[PDB]
Amino acid sequence: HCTEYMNAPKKLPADVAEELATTAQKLVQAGKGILAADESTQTIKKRFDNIKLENTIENRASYRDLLFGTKGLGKFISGAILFEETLFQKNEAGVPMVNLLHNENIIPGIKVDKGLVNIPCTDEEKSTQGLDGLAERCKEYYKAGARFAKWRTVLVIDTAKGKPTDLSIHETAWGLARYASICQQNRLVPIVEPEILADGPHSIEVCAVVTQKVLSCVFKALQENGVLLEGALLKPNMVTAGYECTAKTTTQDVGFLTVRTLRRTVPPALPGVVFLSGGQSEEEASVNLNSINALGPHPWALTFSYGRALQASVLNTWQGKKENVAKAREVLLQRAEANSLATYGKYKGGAGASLYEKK
Amino acid sequence: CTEYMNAPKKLPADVAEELATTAQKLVQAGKGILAADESTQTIKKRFDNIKLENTIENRASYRDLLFGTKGLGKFISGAILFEETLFQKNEAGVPMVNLLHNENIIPGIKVDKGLVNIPCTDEEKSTQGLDGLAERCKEYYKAGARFAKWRTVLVIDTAKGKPTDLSIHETAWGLARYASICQQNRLVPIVEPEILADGPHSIEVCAVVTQKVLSCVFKALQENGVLLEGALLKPNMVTAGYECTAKTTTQDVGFLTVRTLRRTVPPALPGVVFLSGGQSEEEASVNLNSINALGPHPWALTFSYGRALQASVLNTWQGKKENVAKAREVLLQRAEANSLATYGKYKGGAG
Amino acid sequence: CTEYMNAPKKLPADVAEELATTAQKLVQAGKGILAADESTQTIKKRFDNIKLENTIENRASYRDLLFGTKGLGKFISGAILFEETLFQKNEAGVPMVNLLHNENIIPGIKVDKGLVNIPCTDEEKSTQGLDGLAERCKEYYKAGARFAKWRTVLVIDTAKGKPTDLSIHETAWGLARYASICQQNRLVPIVEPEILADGPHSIEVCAVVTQKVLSCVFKALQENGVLLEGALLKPNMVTAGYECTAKTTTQDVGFLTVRTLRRTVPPALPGVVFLSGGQSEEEASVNLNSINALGPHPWALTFSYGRALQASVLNTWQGKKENVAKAREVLLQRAEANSLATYGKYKGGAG
Amino acid sequence: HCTEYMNAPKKLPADVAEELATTAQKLVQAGKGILAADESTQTIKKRFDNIKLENTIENRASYRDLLFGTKGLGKFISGAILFEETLFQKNEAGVPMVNLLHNENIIPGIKVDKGLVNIPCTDEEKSTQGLDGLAERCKEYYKAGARFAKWRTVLVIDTAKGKPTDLSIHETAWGLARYASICQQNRLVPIVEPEILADGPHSIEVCAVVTQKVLSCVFKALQENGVLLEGALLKPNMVTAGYECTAKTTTQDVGFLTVRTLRRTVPPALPGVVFLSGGQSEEEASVNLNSINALGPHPWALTFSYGRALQASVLNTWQGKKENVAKAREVLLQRAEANSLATYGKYKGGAGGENAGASLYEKKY
């Protein structure tokens, strides 16, 4: 066209690039994080099984109404990740549920991946499907009100099986980069999620080594495909020891080795990191996010994209009952504020421990 | 047991063995592939010339015409089908796959879901199709398909640095994922990185680009653990640009094509099935002949031709079943012409 | 617990810790690096412009002039030396290194062995030096050197598709090998991929290329297991080309430079020490100021200047022993000017 | 100028490309292979210890004279890899060593690498030094008469330590590619040697897996550095089990898995493969090379670059003594012809193959 250095990806249009940037900043606003309410019909069934409830469209609509219709939730929540159904759903009173987010001033988002499949020639390592027709879905989702997207990839740590294998790392890293660039082209901020699972008895150090390698590879793919980091977000695992590791580390280690590995791999042009919580308890999700943020004023916003970590108690203190909606939202604000405080490094929770004297 | 773990794993013996034999069969001496995999949209554009409504009965009678030719299997090893055609029956209620089985041809299936633009390129193309591909392959193997096709498209525009790196590895990586999913589900993948001939570039520039693309493609295949022995390559021949950078000869097509392949294709790959592109029926045969005149090669150098085998077969049919005999004449004629070009023994009509 | 093995191993606690502290010291608040690492080849040029003979006594007196300036350590954290100078003594018979030890300035050493052409490129450059580098590093550390320099050179020539991939990866890989050998032998490596300003390209094109090069450089660094915390980057500022046409404002230089670093440099890298290139002493300071006016950065954005710190020091010296004190005044002036630039608090006030 | 595709290595000058091609073909001539005589003063010191004699410049010159002055060795040997000293050396009678080769019509070659060093951040995995001043050494070596070069890199298989690590693979792969590209520009055919050591108890299949991965990486490096495969040769390890492995494997398996892994990774533009022999006995080096070539005609010449496998017994039956030069030269031609026959898949030295085992009745009608 205007013969410049032509072996590099082209720039997004001024207009689209600027909109993506603003949404991304808003998503990691001071003291705010993301609510992952994007559970599928099969996933959201299992949550309703705990509380003895049928997985009906009315029950799903009432629960998302419960969540999104909470007053002053937007104080602590910047965006909400939805499953497709919910983006086009209404509550029993007929109100579009996206407008409940609008009214709390919360940005709607949409899970766009089509799930996991095995990579052949690996030992059941996972590839994330979704690229077919994605551009066209994104246009539709933006019209529906969605301003950002989610795509989840899964890597596993199994040292003796060389596992997260090179194939696994680049399938993941490349698919995330394709996804991200299709989103941005069609005006959605991509949340890039390379979840390294915490399964196994590996040390926190091994996790740091792997998480650092994976992330270097992810960002390299991101640059290859021309992804604008300014209009994008990262949803990584925290750096923890594996689930069955006998050496039980502490929240300060989680905080240090997590911050370290991000500092080595994440360029500051990326406006923020929205941590996934994995199988962490609601409380640990907050304690560990706090320990991360006690460790600095960071070059990017270090915040949360929590589902289970924000919803677990809300479901138990609801039981499908329209009576308990008030007390269910009481708890959601509680958890939302708890993690909003962790964002600052000011969530206490509930050494300097001393019995004192006198003079 | 103490496996070198950072390496793609092997296929199970049984499936690896079946892929290998299918791939060898597909490039049998004196035989090539018939590309019959036109979509409803592309096949309508052919029927647009002969002036028949692109109906399901018209499409079935045309594929019946092609696949029901006696002695076609002497020159054709396999036939690439469209999904419809794979499950379709002719006007006498007979499955097409059975017409190929009778005539001893292996059925194949186009599995890609078409092209889309790569963002942040100048309209360079990404091939869609990976979503649900494994499940479709299982279904196609059950339907009788033993091999697959997936077309990717690259473009030579020197001044714009076309094949940009992004285009080359999006293509190369997509072909490698496709190929490995095919093989796991017992289909021989035809890996097609068509470098289009559009533009005014010289044959040497095409050689440089084709060589670069191919090195990249094969690197991706090894990455993904693709068994070359159970796979085929469908590359462009190395020609100058359509805008004729001083019009080169067929001797030059043959040399620069064979060179580029010798530099980039390991001999474990049992064969290369060339795509015709925008070549006339005769040019497709003359050039394939010039390639094979350059002597016994380390792999089978043969054809996967659609337009180059069907163009005249459409004309001597006109939809009117009075020309089913006459149409099948021109099919066998062209199939034998390219079978002879396989051997390097095809003058064409004097020279 | 049993290591994930497909990854480069850690530095010993002790060596990693020492590299980290040296690297932080080198980018101390309000401080930068003095590039005094001129080879005989190049310093013979500067002596010939001030009409002096290039003798060992003249070289020793000039480095004595520079390093013996009292109060230089206020603005200078480290000094990059040429091999000779590291083992050299003054006319008085006192180690040149001791003059830095006295001003509390850290000595460093250029360790590359110059440039050669990469074959199959159009005269694109490979930096030599890896042979025996480990053993030289041990020797240099014993001589007092705590950090190293290795210069690679890329060129922007859009038409010829310059920094070709070959050039980018040769450069990126050689820097990574160098950087890792240094760190193993207890020297902080300054990683210098200078993209030359030659040509008529826009500042945006430079940004595009500088971004691509840097992504590639840092990828190589992780490959080789380089500790970013114990390393420094010496990149070009993002400017338009020398023979461009636009008037090229200092604010645009600051913005596109900061942008490209934010996209490509992880914050574990404690600082960036900019090369001046062909800029004048003042333009080196104005542009460094414009970079730091763009507000507290995640790393220290400072300087590694030779020409930009020495030009007027040399011309207001002319070789004469009387003019030492007068030349040393001119040195401190420039050192403070860039020290202020570091804070974003230097002279330039056109608004 | 006229714009071609710029993001691609530029070709060799026609004249240089043409010369490298013919040298490479000659080096893998039918029934011929390469004699590795590139032992350093350090390496050769260990050889003379076993034959009791001292390591002097006169001893080294007499031994290389012994080897290169053998009449009719060029029937079986296409080229000889020399150490620098030897390239500029003369015998007692003032005859240059490389002239001994010209008369026997053997092409002289030169080891150009400067040895191995550890890659930091690996567990003692090896980087090959030599690129500094290599271009200038090549010009000198070509003037001295050398037409091809050798550069040895070393990888190790240690599955429990993931060991040939990505880093080891790419340092090796990239250093071989830079070496090769510089050699070709200065008119020397590079022998690219990524020796994967046989140390350990890994199976032959694991070796195949690793050798294939390494080779794919090496060739990727060559193409990106713009190396002309037509003017280059590969000196890989054969695919064998590990040294400690059980007490098992067979020569036909070495042959199959070796041929397989080369077919999957080596483009036919590469005119030939000159196998290194590692720790194999002189006979094993020949038996295995024979098993490789019994597997039908190949798309490239599969031959030998043998040092110890050609010199071990020659050295035993010389003893440093002027008297025995004829006796030793006897054994050199013997081994040289043995491997020349192995090139054809037509060597049989004591065994032959697998059938029944004699004791056959003959009932004529």
CSV table of C-alpha atoms in Angstrom, one decimal, chain A residues 23 26-27 29 32-33 68-80 97-108 147-148:
chain,number,residue,atom,x,y,z
A,23,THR,CA,-12.8,-1.1,27.6
A,26,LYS,CA,-12.4,0.0,32.5
A,27,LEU,CA,-12.4,-3.8,33.0
A,29,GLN,CA,-10.7,-0.1,37.1
A,32,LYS,CA,-12.7,-3.5,40.6
A,33,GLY,CA,-12.6,-6.9,38.9
A,68,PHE,CA,-26.7,-9.0,38.0
A,69,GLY,CA,-29.6,-7.2,39.7
A,70,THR,CA,-27.6,-6.6,42.9
A,71,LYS,CA,-27.5,-2.9,43.9
A,72,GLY,CA,-24.1,-1.3,44.2
A,73,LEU,CA,-22.3,-4.4,42.7
A,74,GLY,CA,-20.7,-2.2,40.0
A,75,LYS,CA,-18.8,-0.6,42.9
A,76,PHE,CA,-16.6,-3.7,43.0
A,77,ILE,CA,-17.4,-5.3,39.5
A,78,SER,CA,-16.3,-3.8,36.2
A,79,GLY,CA,-17.5,-6.5,33.9
A,80,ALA,CA,-19.5,-9.8,33.8
A,97,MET,CA,-30.6,-9.2,31.8
A,98,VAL,CA,-27.8,-7.3,30.0
A,99,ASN,CA,-29.7,-4.1,31.1
A,100,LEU,CA,-29.3,-5.1,34.7
A,101,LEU,CA,-25.5,-4.8,34.2
A,102,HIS,CA,-26.1,-1.6,32.2
A,103,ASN,CA,-27.9,-0.1,35.2
A,104,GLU,CA,-25.1,-1.1,37.6
A,105,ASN,CA,-22.8,0.3,34.9
A,106,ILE,CA,-21.1,-3.2,34.5
A,107,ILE,CA,-19.7,-4.2,31.1
A,108,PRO,CA,-21.1,-7.4,29.6
A,147,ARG,CA,-17.7,-5.6,24.8
A,148,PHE,CA,-15.2,-8.3,25.7
